[PDB]
Nucleic acid binder design. Structure first.
Length: 189
DNA sequence: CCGCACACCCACACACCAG
DNA sequence: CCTGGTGTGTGGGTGTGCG
């Protein structure tokens, strides 16, 4: 065991500000351990999380390519607005928006009738698919808070698990689906 | 005779492939 | 990228034990 010096703490803080989107990873801290060998990713993360976070105060803004924003002379831009992290959580709204989209899909499939009006394209369920061609690709485009892969897995692992109708009755009856799924996150010496 | 340093946990968002 | 099987490591912590 080794104590964290003020110098090291300020180094950890600086690194997180220049890599804000990685603030909640483990890998960021494992990399930091390369420069401050007396410590490990685990101790650095914990040190940051529990002790140093109250001192972050600001991070530097990054662009859409994950890179830092630099000006004419190469200076950075401070911000109290954290950028999006690596993973985005699903919201109840999102779950409902997905379930409904799938329900409408199955409705059109089975009845060849428009769910909104009743126009001829010429309820409940307990079927998995098949899922229409490019359904998730287009769902992602229209709702880009998650990628096509994220939406698809959310449908497979959570929606199909909880049940489309069940979730729709639940949401409307008023939140997100949950807990329907070497040990990772252990970057030791 | 306890606070810090460090280990470890785990559901799961997001990913990729083969058949 | 149709489905299923399955990998990766984040995100948010908790468990442990040294000095």
């Amino acid at each position: 065991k080794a104590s964290f010096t003020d110098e090291e703490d300020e180094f950890i803080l600086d690194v997180v500000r220049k890599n804000p989107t990685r603030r909640t990873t483990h890998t960021l801290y494992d990399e930091i351990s390369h420069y401050v060998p007396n410590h490990t990713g685990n101790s650095i993360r914990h040190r940051f999380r529990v002790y140093l976070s109250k001192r972050l105060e600001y991070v530097y803004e990054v662009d859409k390519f994950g890179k830092l924003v630099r000006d004419d002379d190469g200076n950075l831009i401070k911000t109290k607005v954290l950028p999006p992290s690596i993973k985005r959580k699903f919201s109840a709204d999102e779950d409902y928006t997905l379930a409904i989209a799938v329900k409408k899909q199955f409705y059109r499939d089975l009845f060849q009738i428009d769910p909104d009006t009743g126009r001829s394209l010429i309820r409940t369920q307990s079927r998995r698919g098949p899922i229409a061609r490019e359904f998730f690709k287009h769902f992602a485009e229209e709702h880009a808070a998650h990628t096509e892969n994220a939406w698809r897995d959310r449908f497979r692992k959570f929606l199909l698990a909880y049940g489309i109708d069940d979730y729709i009755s639940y949401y409307e009856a008023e939140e997100p689906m949950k807990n329907l799924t070497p040990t990772p996150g252990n970057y030791n010496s």
